[PDB]
């Protein structure tokens, strides 16, 4: 939770915050997909104002996984009521997520686990299977 969103939350109480975000689809040499376990999730995060969606996904992937990646292709933008989430404490948020297929260029992998498409775990957010293909 960056200082920007943290500051907005302070001022809005539990009210709905619209959060532009990015999520990454990362595959290793053998075709497995990288997921994170806090439901499991794709490496993802909020876009900081000032960053392009591409810069955001590269940064988020580095922070969440330790991998340095470059953007291969955009796999769609998802949003609406199905991407609305209300924290246990009452804080309401709605995401609009830009999904990017990214390729690893450097780094290491800091739970983080690879899963083949057929074995992929369930995700909280309703991303269509097409983002993986």
PDB file of C-alpha atoms in Angstrom:
ATOM      1  CA  UNK A   1       0.000   0.000   0.000  1.00  0.00           C
ATOM      2  CA  UNK A   2       1.917   3.030  -1.302  1.00  0.00           C
ATOM      3  CA  UNK A   3       1.816   6.467   0.321  1.00  0.00           C
ATOM      4  CA  UNK A   4      -0.562   7.725  -2.370  1.00  0.00           C
ATOM      5  CA  UNK A   5      -3.316   5.144  -1.864  1.00  0.00           C
ATOM      6  CA  UNK A   6      -2.597   5.083   1.868  1.00  0.00           C
ATOM      7  CA  UNK A   7      -3.221   8.846   1.954  1.00  0.00           C
ATOM      8  CA  UNK A   8      -6.384   8.553  -0.142  1.00  0.00           C
ATOM      9  CA  UNK A   9      -7.698   5.840   2.175  1.00  0.00           C
ATOM     10  CA  UNK A  10      -7.092   8.070   5.216  1.00  0.00           C
ATOM     11  CA  UNK A  11      -9.313  10.739   3.699  1.00  0.00           C
ATOM     12  CA  UNK A  12     -12.077   8.503   2.328  1.00  0.00           C
ATOM     13  CA  UNK A  13     -12.675   6.196   5.290  1.00  0.00           C
ATOM     14  CA  UNK A  14     -14.129   2.873   4.108  1.00  0.00           C
ATOM     15  CA  UNK A  15     -15.483   4.363   0.875  1.00  0.00           C
ATOM     16  CA  UNK A  16     -14.780   2.906  -2.548  1.00  0.00           C
ATOM     17  CA  UNK A  17     -11.377   3.653  -4.064  1.00  0.00           C
ATOM     18  CA  UNK A  18     -10.931   2.933  -7.801  1.00  0.00           C
ATOM     19  CA  UNK A  19      -7.451   1.388  -8.146  1.00  0.00           C
ATOM     20  CA  UNK A  20      -5.643   1.084 -11.501  1.00  0.00           C
ATOM     21  CA  UNK A  21      -3.541  -2.079 -11.256  1.00  0.00           C
ATOM     22  CA  UNK A  22      -1.342  -4.457 -13.252  1.00  0.00           C
ATOM     23  CA  UNK A  23      -0.905  -8.225 -13.179  1.00  0.00           C
ATOM     24  CA  UNK A  24       1.789 -10.324 -14.814  1.00  0.00           C
ATOM     25  CA  UNK A  25       1.672 -13.627 -16.666  1.00  0.00           C
ATOM     26  CA  UNK A  26       5.180 -15.070 -16.405  1.00  0.00           C
ATOM     27  CA  UNK A  27       6.207 -18.411 -17.896  1.00  0.00           C
ATOM     28  CA  UNK A  28       9.467 -20.276 -17.381  1.00  0.00           C
ATOM     29  CA  UNK A  29      11.411 -22.198 -20.018  1.00  0.00           C
ATOM     30  CA  UNK A  30       9.172 -25.250 -19.539  1.00  0.00           C
ATOM     31  CA  UNK A  31       5.917 -23.324 -19.911  1.00  0.00           C
ATOM     32  CA  UNK A  32       4.764 -23.266 -16.285  1.00  0.00           C
ATOM     33  CA  UNK A  33       3.004 -20.165 -14.909  1.00  0.00           C
ATOM     34  CA  UNK A  34       4.199 -18.210 -11.871  1.00  0.00           C
ATOM     35  CA  UNK A  35       1.777 -17.701  -8.984  1.00  0.00           C
ATOM     36  CA  UNK A  36       2.052 -16.180  -5.512  1.00  0.00           C
ATOM     37  CA  UNK A  37       0.483 -17.384  -2.257  1.00  0.00           C
ATOM     38  CA  UNK A  38      -0.318 -14.694   0.372  1.00  0.00           C
ATOM     39  CA  UNK A  39      -6.535 -18.121  -2.957  1.00  0.00           C
ATOM     40  CA  UNK A  40      -3.315 -17.834  -4.933  1.00  0.00           C
ATOM     41  CA  UNK A  41      -2.637 -14.774  -7.068  1.00  0.00           C
ATOM     42  CA  UNK A  42      -0.776 -13.631 -10.162  1.00  0.00           C
ATOM     43  CA  UNK A  43       2.121 -11.303  -9.346  1.00  0.00           C
ATOM     44  CA  UNK A  44       0.210  -8.005  -9.208  1.00  0.00           C
ATOM     45  CA  UNK A  45       0.004  -4.541  -7.730  1.00  0.00           C
ATOM     46  CA  UNK A  46      -1.377  -1.027  -7.914  1.00  0.00           C
ATOM     47  CA  UNK A  47      -0.091   1.448 -10.484  1.00  0.00           C
ATOM     48  CA  UNK A  48       1.556   4.464  -8.878  1.00  0.00           C
ATOM     49  CA  UNK A  49       0.442   7.755 -10.439  1.00  0.00           C
ATOM     50  CA  UNK A  50       3.148   8.891 -12.841  1.00  0.00           C
ATOM     51  CA  UNK A  51       4.034   5.381 -14.002  1.00  0.00           C
ATOM     52  CA  UNK A  52       2.919   3.960 -17.325  1.00  0.00           C
ATOM     53  CA  UNK A  53       1.201   0.575 -16.943  1.00  0.00           C
ATOM     54  CA  UNK A  54       4.351  -1.055 -18.368  1.00  0.00           C
ATOM     55  CA  UNK A  55       6.640   0.603 -15.827  1.00  0.00           C
ATOM     56  CA  UNK A  56       4.230  -0.426 -13.065  1.00  0.00           C
ATOM     57  CA  UNK A  57       4.195  -4.117 -13.974  1.00  0.00           C
ATOM     58  CA  UNK A  58       7.987  -4.238 -14.237  1.00  0.00           C
ATOM     59  CA  UNK A  59       8.312  -2.634 -10.804  1.00  0.00           C
ATOM     60  CA  UNK A  60       5.621  -4.750  -9.170  1.00  0.00           C
ATOM     61  CA  UNK A  61       7.115  -7.965 -10.548  1.00  0.00           C
ATOM     62  CA  UNK A  62      10.520  -6.987  -9.145  1.00  0.00           C
ATOM     63  CA  UNK A  63       9.109  -6.175  -5.704  1.00  0.00           C
ATOM     64  CA  UNK A  64       6.855  -9.238  -5.457  1.00  0.00           C
ATOM     65  CA  UNK A  65       9.093 -11.871  -7.063  1.00  0.00           C
ATOM     66  CA  UNK A  66      12.661 -10.574  -7.308  1.00  0.00           C
ATOM     67  CA  UNK A  67      12.614 -11.114 -11.085  1.00  0.00           C
ATOM     68  CA  UNK A  68      13.610  -8.481 -13.617  1.00  0.00           C
ATOM     69  CA  UNK A  69      11.202  -8.740 -16.551  1.00  0.00           C
ATOM     70  CA  UNK A  70      10.339  -6.976 -19.782  1.00  0.00           C
ATOM     71  CA  UNK A  71       6.874  -6.631 -21.286  1.00  0.00           C
ATOM     72  CA  UNK A  72       6.102  -9.081 -24.072  1.00  0.00           C
ATOM     73  CA  UNK A  73       2.484  -8.236 -24.819  1.00  0.00           C
ATOM     74  CA  UNK A  74      -0.642  -6.792 -23.262  1.00  0.00           C
ATOM     75  CA  UNK A  75      -3.323  -9.417 -22.629  1.00  0.00           C
ATOM     76  CA  UNK A  76      -6.283  -7.168 -21.925  1.00  0.00           C
ATOM     77  CA  UNK A  77      -7.826  -4.768 -19.437  1.00  0.00           C
ATOM     78  CA  UNK A  78     -10.340  -6.097 -16.930  1.00  0.00           C
ATOM     79  CA  UNK A  79     -12.660  -4.311 -14.550  1.00  0.00           C
ATOM     80  CA  UNK A  80     -16.205  -3.695 -13.410  1.00  0.00           C
ATOM     81  CA  UNK A  81     -18.194  -5.059 -10.481  1.00  0.00           C
ATOM     82  CA  UNK A  82     -16.552  -8.496 -10.666  1.00  0.00           C
ATOM     83  CA  UNK A  83     -13.246  -6.808  -9.759  1.00  0.00           C
ATOM     84  CA  UNK A  84     -14.701  -5.078  -6.719  1.00  0.00           C
ATOM     85  CA  UNK A  85     -13.240  -6.176  -3.378  1.00  0.00           C
ATOM     86  CA  UNK A  86     -14.098  -5.224   0.201  1.00  0.00           C
ATOM     87  CA  UNK A  87     -11.465  -5.867   2.857  1.00  0.00           C
ATOM     88  CA  UNK A  88     -12.443  -7.503   6.143  1.00  0.00           C
ATOM     89  CA  UNK A  89     -12.083  -4.137   7.904  1.00  0.00           C
ATOM     90  CA  UNK A  90     -14.668  -2.567   5.603  1.00  0.00           C
ATOM     91  CA  UNK A  91     -12.359  -0.788   3.153  1.00  0.00           C
ATOM     92  CA  UNK A  92     -13.882  -0.984  -0.317  1.00  0.00           C
ATOM     93  CA  UNK A  93     -11.861  -1.065  -3.519  1.00  0.00           C
ATOM     94  CA  UNK A  94     -12.476  -1.707  -7.184  1.00  0.00           C
ATOM     95  CA  UNK A  95      -9.663  -2.684  -9.493  1.00  0.00           C
ATOM     96  CA  UNK A  96      -9.142  -2.082 -13.193  1.00  0.00           C
ATOM     97  CA  UNK A  97      -6.294  -4.372 -14.175  1.00  0.00           C
ATOM     98  CA  UNK A  98      -4.018  -4.290 -17.212  1.00  0.00           C
ATOM     99  CA  UNK A  99      -2.568  -7.774 -17.721  1.00  0.00           C
ATOM    100  CA  UNK A 100       0.886  -8.148 -19.296  1.00  0.00           C
ATOM    101  CA  UNK A 101       2.653 -11.285 -20.475  1.00  0.00           C
ATOM    102  CA  UNK A 102       6.217 -10.715 -19.285  1.00  0.00           C
ATOM    103  CA  UNK A 103       9.490 -12.467 -19.998  1.00  0.00           C
ATOM    104  CA  UNK A 104      12.292 -12.901 -17.480  1.00  0.00           C
ATOM    105  CA  UNK A 105      15.597 -11.211 -18.328  1.00  0.00           C
ATOM    106  CA  UNK A 106      17.438 -11.408 -15.000  1.00  0.00           C
ATOM    107  CA  UNK A 107      17.091 -11.958 -11.271  1.00  0.00           C
ATOM    108  CA  UNK A 108      16.113 -14.772  -8.979  1.00  0.00           C
ATOM    109  CA  UNK A 109      12.991 -16.024  -7.338  1.00  0.00           C
ATOM    110  CA  UNK A 110      12.767 -14.976  -3.654  1.00  0.00           C
ATOM    111  CA  UNK A 111       5.237 -18.343  -1.377  1.00  0.00           C
ATOM    112  CA  UNK A 112       6.182 -18.262  -5.066  1.00  0.00           C
ATOM    113  CA  UNK A 113       5.499 -21.364  -7.148  1.00  0.00           C
ATOM    114  CA  UNK A 114       5.244 -22.430 -10.784  1.00  0.00           C
ATOM    115  CA  UNK A 115       2.182 -24.340 -12.008  1.00  0.00           C
ATOM    116  CA  UNK A 116       1.418 -25.794 -15.427  1.00  0.00           C
ATOM    117  CA  UNK A 117      -1.743 -24.441 -17.071  1.00  0.00           C
ATOM    118  CA  UNK A 118      -3.648 -27.657 -16.338  1.00  0.00           C
ATOM    119  CA  UNK A 119      -2.643 -27.506 -12.659  1.00  0.00           C
ATOM    120  CA  UNK A 120      -3.046 -23.763 -12.056  1.00  0.00           C
ATOM    121  CA  UNK A 121      -4.603 -22.801  -8.682  1.00  0.00           C
ATOM    122  CA  UNK A 122      -7.823 -20.781  -8.313  1.00  0.00           C
ATOM    123  CA  UNK A 123      -7.528 -16.982  -8.407  1.00  0.00           C
ATOM    124  CA  UNK A 124      -9.681 -14.559  -6.420  1.00  0.00           C
ATOM    125  CA  UNK A 125     -10.168 -12.280  -9.430  1.00  0.00           C
ATOM    126  CA  UNK A 126     -12.099 -13.693 -12.445  1.00  0.00           C
ATOM    127  CA  UNK A 127      -9.372 -13.423 -15.092  1.00  0.00           C
ATOM    128  CA  UNK A 128     -10.361 -15.323 -18.258  1.00  0.00           C
ATOM    129  CA  UNK A 129      -8.159 -18.307 -19.134  1.00  0.00           C
ATOM    130  CA  UNK A 130      -7.260 -16.489 -22.352  1.00  0.00           C
ATOM    131  CA  UNK A 131      -4.653 -14.342 -20.582  1.00  0.00           C
ATOM    132  CA  UNK A 132      -2.574 -17.504 -20.111  1.00  0.00           C
ATOM    133  CA  UNK A 133      -2.755 -18.487 -23.775  1.00  0.00           C
TER     134      UNK A 133
END
